[PDB]
Amino acid sequence: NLAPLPPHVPEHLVFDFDMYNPSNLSAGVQEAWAVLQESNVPDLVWTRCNGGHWIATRGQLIREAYEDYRHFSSECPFIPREAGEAYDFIPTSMDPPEQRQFRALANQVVGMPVVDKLENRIQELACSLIESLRPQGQCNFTEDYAEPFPIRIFMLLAGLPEEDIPHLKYLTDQMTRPDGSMTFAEAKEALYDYLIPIIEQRRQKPGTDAISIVANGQVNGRPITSDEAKRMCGLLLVGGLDTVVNFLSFSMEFLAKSPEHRQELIERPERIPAACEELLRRFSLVALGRILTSDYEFHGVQLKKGDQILLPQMLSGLDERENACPMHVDFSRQKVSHTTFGHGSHLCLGQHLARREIIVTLKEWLTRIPDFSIAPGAQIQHKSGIVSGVQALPLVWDPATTKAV
Numbered sequence: 001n002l003a004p005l006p007p008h009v010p011e012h013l014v015f016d017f018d019m020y021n022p023s024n025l026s027a028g029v030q031e032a033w034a035v036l037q038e039s040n041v042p043d044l045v046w047t048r049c050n051g052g053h054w055i056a057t058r059g060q061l062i063r064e065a066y067e068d069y070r071h072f073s074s075e076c077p078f079i080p081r082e083a084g085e086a087y088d089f090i091p092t093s094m095d096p097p098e099q100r101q102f103r104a105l106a107n108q109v110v111g112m113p114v115v116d117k118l119e120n121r122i123q124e125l126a127c128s129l130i131e132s133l134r135p136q137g138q139c140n141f142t143e144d145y146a147e148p149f150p151i152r153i154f155m156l157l158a159g160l161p162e163e164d165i166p167h168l169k170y171l172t173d174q175m176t177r178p179d180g181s182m183t184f185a186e187a188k189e190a191l192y193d194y195l196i197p198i199i200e201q202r203r204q205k206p207g208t209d210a211i212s213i214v215a216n217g218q219v220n221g222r223p224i225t226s227d228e229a230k231r232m233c234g235l236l237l238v239g240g241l242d243t244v245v246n247f248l249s250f251s252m253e254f255l256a257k258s259p260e261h262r263q264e265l266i267e268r269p270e271r272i273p274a275a276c277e278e279l280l281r282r283f284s285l286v287a288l289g290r291i292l293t294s295d296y297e298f299h300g301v302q303l304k305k306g307d308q309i310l311l312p313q314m315l316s317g318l319d320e321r322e323n324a325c326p327m328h329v330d331f332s333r334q335k336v337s338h339t340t341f342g343h344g345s346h347l348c349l350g351q352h353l354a355r356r357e358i359i360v361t362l363k364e365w366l367t368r369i370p371d372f373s374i375a376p377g378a379q380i381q382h383k384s385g386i387v388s389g390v391q392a393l394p395l396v397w398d399p400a401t402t403k404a405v
């Protein structure tokens, strides 16, 4: 419901946006969040939803606050407060200076050198999955590709069995888009319950998988503790299971609904990397926050020590002040401004893996299934939270005018 207005918040800044169920969700989730950028809405508002918190609505403020970790701390980075307080993943829940030492280790397991070598496998799985679907003339894209493609790449990287996916995906989703059956703290404890014995097993008998590497890792030259390893591995499993998975569905829904854009990439395949960047801007999907470390006047608004502020990564690139005609998709956009992978010291470490998964998907899908559309009479429903997504994406095409590679 609505939390009592704190005594320091003026009524004129109140805009009761619900990040877990925004009122304009039927329009599309990005559209739903973009109501915060209508001309009469201030740059910084307070919502009484979800326990009460600030929201920065414009790219300028969102970038500034992400750079300023001294005032805007990552120690409580989720709304609602009980979720941010419980949240202890590494490096996400840390500020510099301590955060920094943990990035090199995360880089070892998800960074460019890993991705470079993940190459043939990512390519082979994309092709296999898509070829299987091609002669059917239909699929449920979320379950048939968006989930298994990035999730199998991740489970392989992490040396975790594929049969564990349903459990782990359910838990991850409770942390970003809870259905109400579990608190964030319960979902996180269940993830840790899974991870703890595995981490100990791989500290005793190390492999070459990501969990082994983290569990046996060093951080600025000293051994990682079991606790830190667990906190880092939890983050890796959320990144693997609930990021690219959602983004692929926004992108494919857009392509299903825009033949002209499909044609563009079929005719000019070299534009695929640039298209990936533009789609990352338009279909940005993450919204994290920070907590005030002190009372602080920010852009004319009095923020109080301990207030939470939602800083939607999603919103920077949709801001007309960053990109003209922001809801319009233009693969030839010359300065594609966004903070889709974050901003400041926590810039996404998985972004190279994510782009490779996106670009491989766009190329290999359009090769095999160039012409597809939304299933007859389907109304595509989005879902909103810390990471937003697509509930279901039924697609159809005529298989007779397709062929195997």
Ligand code: HEM
Residues within 6 Å of the ligand: 074, 090, 091, 092, 093, 099, 103, 106, 110, 154, 235, 236, 239, 240, 243, 244, 247, 285, 286, 288, 313, 339, 340, 341, 342, 343, 345, 346, 347, 348, 349, 350, 351, 353, 354
């Ligand atoms: C479309 C895909 C993705 C998006 C939009 C995305 C977004 C983000 C964002 C916004 C942050 C910064 C949050 C903050 O302010 O602390 C971040 C951090 C991070 N991401 Fe990603 N991410 C994606 C994919 C991945 C994947 C696939 C992985 C690994 C499998 C991953 C691993 C990480 C890690 C380890 C960090 C922590 C960096 C730090 O706190 O220093 N991400 N991501």
Ligand SMILES: CC1(C)[C@@H]2CC[C@@]1(C)C(=O)C2
Residues within 6 Å of the ligand: 089, 092, 176, 235, 238, 239, 243, 286, 288, 386, 387
């Ligand atoms: C905000 C994120 C996308 C980033 C990586 C996974 C995620 C849900 C986090 O907890 C940190």
Ligand SMILES: [K+]
Residues within 6 Å of the ligand: 075, 076, 077, 084, 085, 086, 087, 088, 093
């Ligand atoms: K915390």
